Design a protein around this ligand. Sequence first.
Ligand code: ANP
Length: 285
Amino acid sequence: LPEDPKWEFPRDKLTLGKPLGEGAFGQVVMAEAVGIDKDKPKEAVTVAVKMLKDDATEKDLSDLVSEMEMMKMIGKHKNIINLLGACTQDGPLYVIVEYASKGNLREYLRARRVPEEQMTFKDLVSCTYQLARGMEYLASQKCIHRDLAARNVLVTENNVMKIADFGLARVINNIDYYKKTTNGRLPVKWMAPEALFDRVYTHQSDVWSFGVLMWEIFTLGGSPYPGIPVEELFKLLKEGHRMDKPANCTNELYMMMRDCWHAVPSQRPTFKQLVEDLDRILTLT
Ligand SMILES: Nc1ncnc2c1ncn2[C@@H]1O[C@H](COP(=O)(O)OP(=O)(O)NP(=O)(O)O)[C@@H](O)[C@H]1O
């Protein structure tokens, strides 16, 4: 792999610790990184390290490299998982990122329905607000995430919501992102119809996904289109089906979901608008 000195971190300053989880393209381990935070240059920082599994494919390696490169481009923001460094030379590829001790949002919510704590309604609105802020920022950086979902949000020790899993994200210009393929690699239940049927993707497709994410949040980690298999959703979406209102959701926030699910992308809210609406709702709690 080519060197990128501004991101490279010395392997001898990294100490791997316990596994945090694994997927079908990589694994993540906790680690201590001495000197990685130049605001505290003497200190060890607890980080997460993404790396290949022993059964990794060639495509897994190219994907991990591509994920690292995307994270170099998306800037820095409180409500996204930020890249901290990488070990790319003379050894296995290590992609070093911010550590979120409370795991992904889907499990965090399902575990707070013995529960860890109780989610107040204010907590859920705040969580929604933070993620709209993250997506607003990503869209300002001309990034479409394409895989927004509760499983791809991470939660820090201080309950900070961080958008993560940039492996499918793309940088676009002004017009729709378009590449025609045989079959897509995006979770169908979170995809905007124009993405599913027309292979086109804009920031407004991410807005659709955000509406699904809202539904996951206010169902405390429920599964979208409950009891509807992916196989049958193609037809139901084309015919205009939409999810019902979660129990713990206000009619105001449900109207917000349904706006995100507008059939016409240009008629959905923008993330800037969602942040403004969510700012108002959250201050009134
Ligand atoms: N920065 C992190 N801090 C703490 N835990 C993490 C971090 N990143 C990932 N994990 C966890 O370790 C596991 C690794 O999975 P991950 O690398 O996130 O891909 P994925 O989200 O499982 N696949 P997908 O949702 O289909 O895109 C997940 O269970 C995460 O919850």
